[PDB]
Ligand binder design. Structure first.
Ligand SMILES: N[C@H](CCC(=O)N[C@@H](CS)C(=O)O)C(=O)O
Ligand SMILES: N[C@H](CCC(=O)N[C@@H](CS)C(=O)O)C(=O)O
Ligand SMILES: N[C@H](CCC(=O)N[C@@H](CS)C(=O)O)C(=O)O
Lengths: 443, 437
């Protein structure tokens, strides 16, 4: 144990936790309590610290470097796949939700309708077999925790400033984070690119938003730092409110909308009725720059990401061989009816493989294979468990947790000028065995 | 006249204020949540606030600001007169005289406090005839709301940047407020005069503190800005955990303490037993800088606060006759060691004065009213309210060297009551700022 944090004497942790709880209040590491009924609609009431790991867990410096250089590679890959409507339409037209999303994509295709931007997130985990950094998810739409992840960097750096050498650790190895500034800056640059100085930013939000303070903070940054107004509306409000003018400008609550920032619309529970599908359509048709576009949203679906990971598919959207190499190194293997992996690599050694739907099947039952629900074959990831202190509604407890590190990218282009393509900070979600937020403690 | 504002627009401002409050830690423990005054980060709620500032003449603002060093210097002087204080408060309620006790014990060992400081607050009203700024109270000890006041300034400037247009108001006109930074600064310079690099600041704190964030924020400036450490402890923790070192240094929980910052101990309720009275005496006898000493507590009590106000008393502690004019001007008529101005000019016109048949005697305070929006537990309502302006002062000196004597930001306290929907506490009222002129 190098810091198996469970060892730390229970007297010194009453104090660290105490300080951790102070800092979170002072710095708005706060969310609506689930237990309080209005805390997702009324700000300023029913507030509570984000559930949190007290001290950061370890992540090799090299694999953190690796994730950092992937960030702009994934950005350009997401833009490239999104430009292929036939790949997208072929792949996915095989789920009422997805099929509704594809409609909207078709409609645009049908109508030949660029300033393109993204604020996206690639989630990784370290795998104990290969010792590799592996991509777990690419989030192309409405990525949370740009603020949270970067208050956490601050929290843990504070804690370590106070308690470090008393524990063997230096804040230095909690990496610097700018996720939320990069985010608001990507937005401000897009608004600039549209070059309507009268335009506001639309931020599409959920009816119930306990995490509303992350959003207000980005809006505060936009307003005070970038001098740009933003307005927050639910999809059903955009259906009642929103109009397109005869020249294709979006007008929501009496103002031009140059940028549409989604922090909603990624779940089917966001579209209770036809009003919300109208609104998504209305907005997509408009000349507003969408953060992100419907094509981007589709790239991010489970189905597209699986298809990307199959042998030879990825390499269709990437010409750079160094990048090709980098991508494939973080991609967990995934396959269909290949006799070679999928009869027999997996039959002998059912150890990795898991079969998943396009129940999971593992281990001895994965001799499903000996007989040819779970439609594709992929490589098993074995995660790093580590001892943690978990602070929740003011109370701590110990557990052994796994961590998922997500790297933000921002991207902005106007037909062939790349204005932004960036690694833009991180967050970490740490969970038992929906968990807590965290950081990493490099190598 | 904010009651005259379209109700759905009002709801937009309140929504923005709630949001700003949350982002910028204008938060306390919710009274409704029982752990919230002990456990940080749980059960938070925004401060009750006035949505938007009442008007305040600018001339009277400047008047209240000029007066802060002058009250800073007067508190200190009265405090130096142990015999006066002793004359005026032997009379009695048990708490006041348990403070005299401790005062006598210090005069007795002829105790020396070479470095003296204050973080104090003069609370004022504009009275709606004569149009004069009048002192309501002089708070010498444990003055709350330096963070909260200067947050309220941020709030109202931000709302006015958004809405002031429509409204006809410029954010400009809400006075700039640095209360919390000047608070930490005074404590920083104090630690620095004392000159023990390894010493911490002790903040003396109530068992239950829903306003703890104000205190932690001050400790964060101390720690991050000034690189000074602090610990918090209740009076009974000090009794259990502290002691005087052979050279006189205070040591609490094995830490040397150079500065004792009172955020508790101004109410009998802070002394349930003889533990906390020990703790109070122990720190007084030590050589730690008290913020404030026992003499300053005394200068701010009801009985003394009245005594200076009566005619003549005030000349004994002030030399500058301007400063005597400034003080008399915000001094409201104050009387009775025997006066024929009692019940005379007072049973006959009792709508001015206060306090005889019909704890002594003042000119009556007729406050300006303004329509206001009040926000409490995420809910707003309209209300007609009165405001009380608190001007902070910071003072520090080392023998004859005045290191700091200074006006240091403000708070405003605004409440409905008497002619409308309430009940007497203030229901601590709400937090406010002012709009000049
Ligand atoms: N309710 C929004 C929705 C955003 C969201 O669901 N984000 C997912 C991204 S799809 C995440 O874990 O990033 C929030 O928490 O800010
Ligand atoms: N709990 C104390 C309360 C101290 C206090 O109530 N101060 C009052 C009266 S001395 C004030 O209005 O300043 C704090 O916040 O530090
Ligand atoms: N409003 C602040 C001033 C802070 C202060 O003391 N303000 C009074 C002078 S006391 C004022 O007239 O603003 C400013 O505008 O700079």
């Amino acid at each position: 144990p190098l810091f198996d944090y469970h060892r730390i004497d229970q007297k010194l942790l009453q104090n660290i936790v105490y300080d951790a709880l102070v800092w979170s209040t002072l710095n708005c590491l706060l969310v609506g309590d689930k237990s309080v009924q209005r805390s997702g609609r009324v700000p300023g009431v029913g507030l509570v610290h984000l559930p949190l790991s007290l001290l950061p867990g370890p992540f090799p410096e090299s694999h953190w470097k690796q994730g950092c250089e992937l960030a702009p590679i994934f950005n350009e890959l997401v833009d490239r796949v999104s430009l292929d409507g036939k790949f997208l339409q072929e792949s996915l037209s095989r789920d009422e939700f997805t099929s509704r999303l594809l409609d909207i994509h078709s409609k645009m295709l049908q109508i030949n309708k660029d300033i393109r931007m993204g604020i996206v997130r690639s989630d990784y985990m370290i795998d104990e077999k290969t010792k590799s950094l592996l991509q777990i998810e690419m989030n192309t739409i409405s990525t949370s925790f740009a603020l949270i992840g970067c208050l956490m960097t601050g929290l843990h750096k504070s804690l370590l400033s106070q308690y470090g050498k008393f524990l063997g650790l230096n804040s230095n190895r909690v990496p610097a984070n700018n996720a939320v500034d990069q985010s608001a800056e990507a937005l401000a640059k897009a608004w600039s690119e549209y070059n309507n100085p009268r335009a506001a930013i639309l931020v599409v939000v959920q009816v119930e938003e306990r995490n509303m303070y992350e959003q207000h903070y980005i809006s505060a940054l936009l307003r005070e730092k970038h001098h740009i107004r933003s307005i927050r509306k639910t999809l059903t409000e955009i259906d009642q409110e929103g109009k397109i003018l005869p020249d294709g400008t979006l007008s929501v609550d009496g103002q031009a909308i140059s940028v549409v920032y989604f922090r909603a619309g990624y779940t089917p529970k966001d579209y209770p009725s036809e009003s919300e599908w109208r609104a998504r359509l209305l907005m997509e048709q408009s000349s507003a720059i969408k953060c992100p576009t419907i094509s981007y949203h589709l790239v991010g679906t489970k189905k597209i990401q699986q298809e990307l990971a199959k042998p030879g598919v990825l390499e269709r959207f990437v010409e750079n061989k160094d990048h090709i190499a980098k991508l494939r190194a973080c991609f967990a293997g995934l396959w269909s009816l290949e006799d070679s992996d999928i009869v027999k690599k997996a039959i002998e050694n059912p150890e990795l493989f898991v079969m998943k739907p396009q129940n999971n099947i593992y281990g001895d039952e994965l001799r499903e294979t000996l007989l040819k629900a779970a439609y594709i074959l992929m490589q098993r990831i074995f995660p790093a468990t580590s001892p943690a202190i978990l602070v929740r509604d003011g109370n701590w407890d110990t557990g052994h947790v796994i961590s998922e590190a997500g790297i933000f990218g921002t991207y902005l282009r106007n037909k062939d000028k790349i204005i932004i393509n960036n690694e833009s900070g991180y967050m970490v979600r740490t969970k038992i065995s929906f968990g807590v937020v965290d950081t990493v403690y490099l190598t």
